[PDB]
Amino acid sequence: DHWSLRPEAPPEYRICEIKYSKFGVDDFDFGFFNNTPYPGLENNITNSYANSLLQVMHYTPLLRNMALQHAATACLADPCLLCELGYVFDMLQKGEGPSCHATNMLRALNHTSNASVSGVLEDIAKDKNPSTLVKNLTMFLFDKISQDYKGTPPISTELERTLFKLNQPPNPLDLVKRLLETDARYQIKCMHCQHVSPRTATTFVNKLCYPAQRITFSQVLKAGLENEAVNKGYCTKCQRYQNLDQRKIIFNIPAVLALCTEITTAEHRKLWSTPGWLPEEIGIIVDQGHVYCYEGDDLKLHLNRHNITVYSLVGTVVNVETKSPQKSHLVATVNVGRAEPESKDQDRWHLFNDFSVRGISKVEALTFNAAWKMPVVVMFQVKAANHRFNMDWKTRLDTSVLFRDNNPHALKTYELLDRETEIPGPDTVIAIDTEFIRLKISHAIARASVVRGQGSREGVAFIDDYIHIKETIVDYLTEWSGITPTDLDPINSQRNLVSPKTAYKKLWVLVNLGCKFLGHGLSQDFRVINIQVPRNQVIDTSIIFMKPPSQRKISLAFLAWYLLKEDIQQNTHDSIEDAQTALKLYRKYEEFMANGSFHDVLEALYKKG
Ligand SMILES: [Zn+2]
Ligand SMILES: [Zn+2]
Numbered sequence: 001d002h003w004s005l006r007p008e009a010p011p012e013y014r015i016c017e018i019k020y021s022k023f024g025v026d027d028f029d030f031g032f033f034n035n036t037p038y039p040g041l042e043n044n045i046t047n048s049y050a051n052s053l054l055q056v057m058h059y060t061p062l063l064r065n066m067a068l069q070h071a072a073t074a075c076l077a078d079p080c081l082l083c084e085l086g087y088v089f090d091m092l093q094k095g096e097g098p099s100c101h102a103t104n105m106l107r108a109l110n111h112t113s114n115a116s117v118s119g120v121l122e123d124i125a126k127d128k129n130p131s132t133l134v135k136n137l138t139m140f141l142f143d144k145i146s147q148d149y150k151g152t153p154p155i156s157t158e159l160e161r162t163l164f165k166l167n168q169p170p171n172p173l174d175l176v177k178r179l180l181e182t183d184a185r186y187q188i189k190c191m192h193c194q195h196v197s198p199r200t201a202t203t204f205v206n207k208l209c210y211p212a213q214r215i216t217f218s219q220v221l222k223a224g225l226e227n228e229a230v231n232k233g234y235c236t237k238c239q240r241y242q243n244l245d246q247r248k249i250i251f252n253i254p255a256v257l258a259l260c261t262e263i264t265t266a267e268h269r270k271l272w273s274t275p276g277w278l279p280e281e282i283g284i285i286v287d288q289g290h291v292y293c294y295e296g297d298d299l300k301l302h303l304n305r306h307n308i309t310v311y312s313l314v315g316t317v318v319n320v321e322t323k324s325p326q327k328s329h330l331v332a333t334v335n336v337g338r339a340e341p342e343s344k345d346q347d348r349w350h351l352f353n354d355f356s357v358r359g360i361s362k363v364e365a366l367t368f369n370a371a372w373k374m375p376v377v378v379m380f381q382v383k384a385a386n387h388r389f390n391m392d393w394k395t396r397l398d399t400s401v402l403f404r405d406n407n408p409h410a411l412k413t414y415e416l417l418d419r420e421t422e423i424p425g426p427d428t429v430i431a432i433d434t435e436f437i438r439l440k441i442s443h444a445i446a447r448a449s450v451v452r453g454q455g456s457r458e459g460v461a462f463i464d465d466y467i468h469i470k471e472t473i474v475d476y477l478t479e480w481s482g483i484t485p486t487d488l489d490p491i492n493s494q495r496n497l498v499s500p501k502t503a504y505k506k507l508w509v510l511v512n513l514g515c516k517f518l519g520h521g522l523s524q525d526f527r528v529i530n531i532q533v534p535r536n537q538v539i540d541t542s543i544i545f546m547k548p549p550s551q552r553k554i555s556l557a558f559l560a561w562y563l564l565k566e567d568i569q570q571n572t573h574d575s576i577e578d579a580q581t582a583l584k585l586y587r588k589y590e591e592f593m594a595n596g597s598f599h600d601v602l603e604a605l606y607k608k609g
Contacts, residue, residue: 002360004367013320013373015329016356018044024441026523033356034098038336039091040355042101043329047109047122048354049130050137052332054088054102055352056315056379057141059339061388062160062179062256063381064089067145069154072393072512074400078501079108081141082148087508091532094511099355104504104530111470112144130330131319131376135260138317138377142180142204142258149176156392163255163385180204182225183252187289189245190235197236201248205258210268217278218293221259225250225291249289257311257380269370278366280313280335282380310383314338316365317377330376333365342387394512399423401505402462407496413576414449414464414496415457422455422462426514429453429539431579432507434525435483438475443528446476446483448503449575450510453518453583461576465503466495482572507531520556520582541585547606554605556581562605563588 003010021027025044034040041051057063071086084105091100109115119125119136127133150172161169164178177183186199209223227248235242263269271277283299285292285307294302302308315334322328337348349365351358368374403419417424424430431451436443450463466487476483486492511517511533518539519525526533542553560566560581568581592598 002364002367004364004369004373006369007371008323009320009372012351012356012358013331013353014322015327016043016354018042018355026527030097030099030355034358036350036357036359038350038352038357039095039098039100040352040357042099043354045101045103045106047106047120047133048102049122049133049330050102050106050109051354052317052330052352053134053137053141053377054085054105055092055332056317056334056377057085058089058092059334059336060256060314060379060381061339062163062385064093064339065159065388065390065393066149066154066176066179068393069156069390070149070152071508072155072397073152074398075152076401076502076505077148077151078499079111080148080501081105081108081112082145083501083505084108085141085145087504087531090508090512091530094532094534096532096535098357100532101527101530104500107471108501115140130328131374134317134330134376138258138260139205146176146180146204154393155396155398156390158392159388159390160255163382163388178252179255180258181252181254182206182250184248184250186227187247187249188233189247190237191230191243191245193235193238193242195235195237199246205260207260207262209262210271212267215271216295218282218295218298221282221284221293222291224259225253247289250286250291251289253284253286253291253309255382255385259378259380261375261378263374263376266370269374272368272374273370275367278313278316278368278375278378280362280366281383282311282313283308284311285309311380312338312383312386314379314381316375316379318368319374319376321372321374323372333360335365338381338386339389340387397509397512399509399513401502402509406498409494409496411494412464412496414461417462422452424510424513424515428513429516429518430510431518431583432522432525433519433575433579433582434529435477435481435573435575436528437469437473437477437481437483440472440474444469444471445500445503445528446481446488447575448507448529449579450507451576451579451583453516459580459583461579463503463506464496464576465506466493466497467500467503468497469500478572480573482574504529504531511537518583518586519579520559520585521553539586541582541589544586544589545602545605547602550606556585559585563601 003012018028067082067086067089071083075083088102088105115121116124118140120140122128122133157169157175160175182203184201186201187196188199189196206224208220210220229246231244232241233244279295283294315332318331318333319328320331332352335349337346347362349360349362351360402417405416431453433449434445435447437446445467448465449461451461452458468490487495490497516537516539517533521542522540545554545559557569560568564584592601
């Protein structure tokens, strides 16, 4: 009937391999694995286990908004996982192609504090099981982005204010706590003199708890949130060690409810394999330090009769086992309808097996198999937050990073944008080109040049950032890029050497400002830059000068030689020059189209080898 009923993982659930060539990743047919408007994530990256989690979080409206409202600020923190989260979320909502990738964000994770000791790095972590890794990451991320959010005031808290029906705008500290934390504390009572003493409790992600017939998910959730225990400890009142009654007094439940299944035994898998065991909708009651959860018709009855906060199931991080050779990898089954305008079709579940995306039924999404298909992380959010969004992060996007000057050297190869006269917009055209280096084939941006495409200073660069790469560079590609170790050396560089996220922030802002990116073969640049740019914001000269059927692209050097009569390969490649070259080529294209000679020129371009 459906895939999850099979004794083994069907090809739709198996690991998807990327096949490589000399051309590289770009020639690989990602479109074969995804025919949906919902892009997947590529899995040829270190710590790519995060893909399933990133997907589930992205289609959680409160989480996506949270990240975007922060990323749109003037935050120059690097590494900063919340900013990186905003970038990835932005790519997943902008992406017109079949696949995206979170290279920059997984690289930044590797540099994040306490990452090497939180078991979130598959090369360092003790337990290298993907299910364990994504459990730790879920806890690690929720903790990190919570303090990242309060670091600098977000662009807008208007969504949350409306959601929580507040009158005055809430402050970040109280807000992020209501969104992610389970407000609670431990009441430690001496069982002799009945003396009570409090112990603070911090909880971002909760863990399910199982007993040991008719065991429900609501009961397992309730058992997980609460915590009653008895341990011997000293009592200050009666001056001796007594039995202490310790109960977790619960005050508030988070707007975003992340849950770890903690499946360890065979009995746990038998329980989860029960058809219809996982409800897509739950209601939780917090009364006098206790938590009461309801589901199904039992939930409907209580609602007809109180403090019942209805939660909607967003998605599930699922562990998929393969019998031979024995292993495991993660996929994501998500209802993408939660983050979309409300329609009649509420059931919009999709399978996110890395870059392989497929639509599935509610049954399949809520069906689990004790042999190979088991849930790891379950994501709920308040139903009132469904189909909600806020565009103030884009409307009031902070652009200070474009105008700020922190370059010590007086000799620059760029002239920054004037804050008054040169404010980028939808009509603004910019020419861009980058330079690559080799990492321990893995490429990385070593230099990014953006050039004015119009105005009196047309051709003059306003961005020429060199990247302080915190990785090990195998090859500088000096013949190909003209990049020397001195240019990237923080002590001896004469360049505007900046952090990776600092330079990325500029480009990310320019995209959301609506700017049109002009260049030659920009698809390779954007991939290594790790960004997604809409088609109507891309002016590519390699695409422009194609004769329609051939699909073969002309070199930048040949176009410059034939249309501009220039030799641009004399010295080593310079990203500013190559950007100016592409801009010149586009201006020639405008001339050819205007006088109606473009057809003849295009024909002339294709005559010999
Ligand atoms: Zn940030
Ligand atoms: Zn006592």
